[PDB]
Structure formats: C-alpha cells, structure tokens
Design a protein around this ligand. Structure first.
Ligand code: OVG
Length: 188
C-alpha cells in the first residue's frame, strides 16, 4: 500500500480508548520540537488538512531536562489553563534552546510576565489544583503509551506518526507528507 505500517506510521500494540483525536507531545528541551514550532509549523499545517472543528491537543513531557523539565510541564499546564499557549510557546522555546536564559522556575515565570500575564494571575494558576490536575492529565496521556521520544503525534489513540520514514531533503515536502499522513490516519 501507499501508506504502510512501519513507514509513515506505526500502530500501537495497546490502543488507548477515549484518547484525543490528534494528540501531540513535545518538550521545550527537544530540538526537533523547536523546529516543529518555528521552522515547520507542524501543528498549524496539520490543522489545515483536517476538517474544521477537529480537536487537537498538545501536551508537554517530563523526561527531558530533570527538575526544569517538570517545571515546564507545570508551566504548560498554566499556559493551557489561562489560554496563553500562543503567547508563550516561542519565548519558552527560545529561552530554553536559543538564549539559554531559562534556568529556573523564576525564569519561566519571567517569560509569562514579559508576555503580559499578570504576576498574581500566573502565581494563582501555578499553585491551583486545576493546574495540578492538568499536570496529571499530561503525565497520564504520555504514560498511556510509555512515551520515550518527542515530538510525537498520536491519532485516535491508535496510530503513531513516524517522521523518520518521511522525506527530509525538502522542509515543505516533509510537512506535507506529515500532514497528509495525519489526514489518512484520521480517516481510518
Ligand atoms: C523521537 C526520536 C527522534 C526520531 O524521530 C524523528 C526523526 C526525524 C525528524 C525530522 C526531520 C526534519 O524535519 O529536519 C523532524 O522530526 C523528526 C523526528
């Protein structure tokens, strides 16, 4: 077949019931994740190839970066609770990987302050049980598939994108193959 298990995607041995339809995992420490954001805009390009209104979910992971990795999962929970993902994604990626100015939880908070989130609002979210539950939700989704690598995308809890099987001589062709694979998997 044109699309084959092991080429553009793999199939989970144990599918996850009730999973998000399109579920992405990333780390702000992850170099390909930085590219998926700033260079390729994978999430945007997948969204454009899917029907309007499809639920896309994006979660942070703990397993890169030790203490700060977990702080960043909690900060991503704050971003989701406040709805400010689009305001903080690029400065968090650049703070961790480009300028390397993010070395502590306080430095993460600085990114939100600079992006216009009030200190009181950030701190109240950071310490809220709503955010505690969002941290648990991110961990559970990753645990459901023993995730050991990012960037990762899962479709309907059943299929995992396999970017290592896609063309990388051309960045736009790669994005198109990735997005068309998501569309194919979503229609299975
Ligand atoms: C999870 C461990 C890493 C393996 O998974 C990959 C392999 C290659 C790529 C490229 C290529 C590009 O666009 O420059 C973008 O993301 C990738 C993820």
């Amino acid at each position: 077949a044109q699309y084959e298990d092991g080429k553009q995607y793999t199939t989970l041995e144990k599918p996850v019931a009730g999973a998000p339809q399109v579920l992405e995992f990333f780390s702000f420490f992850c170099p390909h994740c930085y590219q998926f954001e700033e260079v390729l805009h994978i999430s945007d390009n997948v969204k454009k190839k899917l029907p309007e209104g499809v639920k896309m979910t994006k979660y942070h992971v703990n397993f890169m970066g030790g203490d700060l990795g977990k702080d960043l999962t909690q900060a991503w929970a704050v971003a989701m609770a406040l709805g400010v993902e689009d305001k903080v994604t690029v400065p968090l990626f650049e703070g961790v990987q480009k300028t390397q100015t993010i070395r502590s939880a306080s430095d993460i908070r600085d990114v939100f302050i600079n992006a216009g989130i009030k200190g009181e609002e950030y701190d109240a979210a950071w310490n809220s049980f709503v955010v505690k539950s969002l941290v648990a939700q991110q961990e559970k989704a990753a645990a459901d598939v023993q995730l050991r690598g990012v960037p990762a995308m899962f479709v309907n809890g059943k299929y995992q994108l396999n970017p290592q099987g896609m063309d990388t001589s051309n960045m736009d062709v790669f994005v198109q193959q990735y997005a068309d694979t998501v569309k194919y998997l979503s229609e299975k």
